[PDB]
Amino acid sequence: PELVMRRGEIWQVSLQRPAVVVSNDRANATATRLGRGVITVVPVTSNIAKVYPFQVLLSATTTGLQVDCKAQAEQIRSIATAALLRPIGRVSAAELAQLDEALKLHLDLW
Amino acid sequence: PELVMRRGEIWQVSLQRPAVVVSNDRANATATRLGRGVITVVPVTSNIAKVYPFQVLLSATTTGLQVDCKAQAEQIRSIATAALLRPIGRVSAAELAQLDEALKLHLDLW
């Protein structure tokens, strides 16, 4: 019954598309305990023709995705935990640090 | 025809609810020129019973809202510019700096 979702994990979500959890893990742990709540995710796409600085290339060899993909920080959304369908994998700590920078760039956070 | 939206502005948006634009103004200026694109907003609510650190109290005397409200950074969403309905007002630069901190807290950005 405990639905555990972690920052940096890649989940299939209903917006069905993969996405990276980017809400902090204290907020995630609260949604786990309550069995409800908002998670914030960054959608992922397999079209990597142009990777902008507000997007992060995610290698297939680590993510559980079968192709190289890019996280689109400009498409960030908050969803209900009821929209979390299944976990797919995880981005590496280096990719997540890159996603931190892409999020700060997109949101004008310096 | 030029639809100009700025970071820190408060707009009525279709999710109809007020929200604070938090996407950077280079991304906003691009959506203005192209006449399409994603904007990132933080929804605002008039229930200020508990203001959590990932939320920011917005005073009525500055926002064009008639009551004190709070921006909910944990409810951040990206919307199409076609979902921007009308501008309502603007948060002060001090409130926006507070919203920057609430966004960094919610997104685990240090």
Listing DSSP states for A11-60 in one string gives EEE---EEEEE-S-HHHHHHHHHHT--EEEEEEEES--SS--TTEEEE-H
Compare all CA atoms of chain B with the CA of A107 and give the residue at the minimum distance. Answer: B23
Nearest to A17 by CA among A98, A94, A84: A84
Nearest to B62 by CA among B72, B75, B52, B71: B71
- On the CB side of B44, how many CA atoms lie within 13 Å of its CA? 32
Indicate left, alpha or beta for A27 from its phi (over 0: left) and psi (-120 to 50: alpha): alpha
Q: What is the 3-state secondary structure (H, E, C) of B46-74?
A: CCCCCCCCCEEEECHHHHCCCCCEEEEHH
| Residue A33 CB partners (closer than 8 Å, separation 6+) | none
Nearest to B44 by CA among B23, B73, B66: B73
Method: X-ray
- Mutation target to probe the A interface, by most A beta carbons within 10 A, among B72, B75, B109, B110 is B109
- Using an 8 Å CB-CB cutoff, list chain A residues near B40: 74, 76, 106-107
Interface touch A22/B78, C-beta < 8 Å: no
C-alpha–C-alpha distance, residues B39 and B23, integer Å: 6
Distances (CA, A) of B12 to A99, B7, B9, B45: 29, 14, 10, 12
Interface touch A78/B78, C-beta < 8 Å: no
The conformation of residue B102, written as its DSSP 8-state character, comes to: H
Beta strands in chain B (DSSP E): 9-13, 17-21, 38-45, 55-58, 69-72, 77-80, 84-90
Length of chain B: 110
| Residue A87 CB partners (closer than 8 Å, separation 6+) | A5, A9, A10, A11, A12
| Residue A3 CB partners (closer than 8 Å, separation 6+) | A31, A32, A35, A81, A84
Minimal CA separation from A100 to chain B, in Å: 6
Compare all CA atoms of chain B with the CA of A79 and give the residue at the minimum distance. Answer: B75
Give the closest of B40, B74, B104 to A106, CB-based: B40
Element (H, E) at B30: helix B25-34
Q: Which residues of A15-28 are buried (b: 16+ CB within 10 A; e: fewer)?
A: eeebbbbbbbeebb
CB proximity under 8 Å: B 23-42 to A: 23-25, 27, 38, 40
User: Which residues make beta-bridge pairs with B77?
Assistant: B41
Q: Is B85 on the interface with A (CB under 8 A)?
A: no
C-alpha–C-alpha distance, residues A27 and A23, integer Å: 7
C-beta atoms surrounding B100 within 10 Å: 19
CB proximity under 8 Å: A 52-71 to B: 54
Resolution given for this structure, in angstroms: 1.9
> Is the separation of the CB atoms in B40 and A40 below 8 Å?
no
Interface touch B38/A78, C-beta < 8 Å: no
Kindly state the tokens that stand for B110: 């240090």
The three-point CA angle A13-B13-B72 to 5° equals: 65
